[PDB]
Design a protein around this ligand. Structure first.
Ligand SMILES: *[C@@H]1O[C@H](CO)[C@@H](O[C@@H]2O[C@H](CO)[C@@H](O)[C@H](O)[C@H]2NC(C)=O)[C@H](O)[C@H]1NC(C)=O
Ligand SMILES: *[C@@H]1O[C@H](CO)[C@@H](O[C@@H]2O[C@H](CO)[C@@H](O)[C@H](O)[C@H]2NC(C)=O)[C@H](O)[C@H]1NC(C)=O
Ligand SMILES: *[C@@H]1O[C@H](CO)[C@@H](O)[C@H](O)[C@H]1NC(C)=O
Ligand SMILES: *[C@@H]1O[C@H](CO)[C@@H](O)[C@H](O)[C@H]1NC(C)=O
Lengths: 21, 21
């Protein structure tokens, strides 16, 4: 729906702390 | 860089939710 939206990664800070746990 | 900064612990709430799993 958003006119002009762009693709980028969004960093989830939880994911690596689960990955290291 | 901060004039007058003080040392204290900062509680991360996710760390114990991992540690208690
Ligand atoms: C942003 O990402 C989406 C998803 O990868 C891209 O959408 C695809 O575009 C191609 C054509 O270039 C289509 O054949 C695919 O079917 C599309 N995927 C989906 C899920 O619809 C989109 O093109 C990307 N935007 C830019 C500017 O690169
Ligand atoms: C806040 O903590 C830092 C350490 O994290 C203290 O810095 C040390 O200070 C001593 C002298 O008191 C130096 O010999 C060390 O080299 C310092 N450590 C580092 C890593 O630079 C700092 O003094 C503390 N602040 C207060 C007001 O106690
Ligand atoms: C800016 O203009 C281009 C065409 O010149 C258009 O394809 C694009 O969607 C527009 N971007 C935004 C953010 O409106
Ligand atoms: C207040 O003054 C003391 C010295 O009297 C100094 O060490 C400290 O950095 C100062 N704190 C601030 C917030 O300016």
């Amino acid at each position: 729906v958003v006119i002009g939206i762009v693709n980028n990664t969004v960093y989830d800070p939880l994911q690596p702390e689960l990955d290291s746990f």
